[PDB]
Amino acid sequence: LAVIKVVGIGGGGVNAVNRMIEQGLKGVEFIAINTDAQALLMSDADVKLDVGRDSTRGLGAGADPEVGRKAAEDAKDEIEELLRGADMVFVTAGEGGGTGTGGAPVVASIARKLGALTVGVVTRPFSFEGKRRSNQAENGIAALRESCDTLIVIPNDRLLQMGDAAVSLMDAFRSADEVLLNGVQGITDLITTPGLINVDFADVKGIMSGAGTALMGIGSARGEGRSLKAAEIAINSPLLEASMEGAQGVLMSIAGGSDLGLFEINEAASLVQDAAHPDANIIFGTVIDDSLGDEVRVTVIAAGF
Amino acid sequence: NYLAVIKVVGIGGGGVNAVNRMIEQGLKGVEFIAINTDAQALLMSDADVKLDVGADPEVGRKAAEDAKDEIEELLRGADMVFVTAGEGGGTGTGGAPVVASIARKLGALTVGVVTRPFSFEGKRRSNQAENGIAALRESCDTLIVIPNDRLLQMVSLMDAFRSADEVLLNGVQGITDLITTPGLINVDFADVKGIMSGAGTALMGIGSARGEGRSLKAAEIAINSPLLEASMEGAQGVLMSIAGGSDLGLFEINEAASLVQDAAHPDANIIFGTVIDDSLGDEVRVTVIAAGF
Ligand SMILES: Nc1nc2c(ncn2[C@@H]2O[C@H](COP(=O)(O)OP(=O)(O)OP(O)(O)=S)[C@@H](O)[C@H]2O)c(=O)[nH]1
């Protein structure tokens, strides 16, 4: 029985976590960490830690990653005591600001020192947010990559090539929330709510330990050929950056109702094998989600390029 | 007065987190108080009462001494006060003895709970973990000490940390449930205060079993628990609680009570009772608190 903790750090990471809780992600503990007390009062997370209170006064790191790093580092004994006991820790954030960029690698190092399987799931900021945010994100992601077993990086620019062409700014960030949720859930649900093909904590640990930098694809479909269509959308996802063909490690999850049959699961698995690198290690798992109706949802995590 | 007022104080990050765990598990019958002692960080809490007085012990001490009047008003009216800094050190280990000394000067039966870290955790300067224990011991009636090393005789690294949190919770719940939650055998609060006032250091033992002979079996595990450090023979004050379902029988109960008397020192005071927790199914859980020598 694996204990899984999902940490959101900074405003975007805390909003993603609220989204995960709102959509009913189960079997995990939710921890919100931020440098803004008011923002934390609105969070529904199980654990809420306000950090950098004297350096920031509950107003955020003002986009300075050094302030975020030092806020997390000063609270490190306390974060450690919140994490101890976890088998698996997710660290989620929008890279580019001060709190998430700076604090995420601290939270991840602590998880990794404890020997929890440590997965980062972060976005790169949209190009329209400016060169400073993109540059801070890039350094934040390099730092985090040193501290995580696997680091899933979602390029927010690619999200604009999905969903609706007439989205607002608020919509774009809700979509970033959703994808961070998809990243976490596509993995955690293999463990907490397996279907016919059970990929347990040990299997996940074996493919994700020390895997390095990763990308994700997602796909969903209904009606005839839903499994094949969902997998083909996930494999060709703009978030995966056309790089599925080069990944050496691939974890795939297919979610559907109680009645998702082996035939459908296997058809999706077969399309994914064919698209993969010839020497790829691919693990295929299933998820029971009875709220899905006639839809199935495929998530692909690709690493080892 | 007649429903004993019990206040459980978590202080510092490990203490507030312990209290938040107690709330999450539905520990009943007590009032929870979360005291944050760090200037730079605040762990939030759903405790009834919260005080933010904000990793050095001296820092926590000074912060709580500064807030001594408001802590006093939070504690006034309690018959019993538990204080803990929970797992890991920090400012809470400095604040805990201050809250304890205020509880005790008010007349409340003051019970500290403190953990000794696992040895593989290493050690911070100035012997600060033992200084915390010594200072907390000076200001409590009873100090329950949980030696985390002993858990490894009861294991993976994650299991070790999890068992530590679980036994810490039990350090409070085994006693509070005995007092606050009816069972077939109930106790007098005066007798609790009789064994625990001025008693000094105590240790705890736990045991669980199912099926035939469950009560005897869980009691036997509890009495021989590595966490008791074989202090059962010499102990002058013993509390034993047996938690189980409604159908817990008087005969099996009494067999457990008889075992504890036999195992304990001839001159021991023994307080014994049961707790009805209908969520345990066919399982029985025993807590033994051994105090004195
Ligand atoms: N997923 C998600 N991402 C967001 C949201 N708001 C902003 N972002 C993204 O996250 C990045 C970091 O912003 P944010 O998380 O708010 O900063 P912070 O880490 O809290 O940093 P600060 O203390 O300096 S204000 C932004 O550059 C943007 O790309 C949100 O609501 N949800």
Curated annotation (Swiss-Prot), chain B:
Q: In the record, what terms sit under GO molecular function?
A: GTP binding; GTPase activity
> What organism is listed for this UniProt entry?
Mycobacterium tuberculosis (strain CDC 1551 / Oshkosh)
What residues bind GTP, as annotated? G13, G14, G15, V16, N17, G90, T91, G92, E121, R125, D165
Q: Which residues of the full protein are shown?
A: 6 to 312 of 379
Quaternary context? Homodimer. Polymerizes to form a dynamic ring structure in a strictly GTP-dependent manner. Interacts directly with several other division proteins.
Keyword annotations of the record: Cell cycle, Cell division, Cytoplasm, GTP-binding, Nucleotide-binding, Septation
Stated name of the protein: Cell division protein FtsZ
Q: What is the lineage of its organism?
A: Bacteria, Bacillati, Actinomycetota, Actinomycetes, Mycobacteriales
GO terms for biological process, alphabetical: division septum assembly; FtsZ-dependent cytokinesis; protein polymerization
GO terms under cellular component? cell division site; cytoplasm
Localisation: Cytoplasm
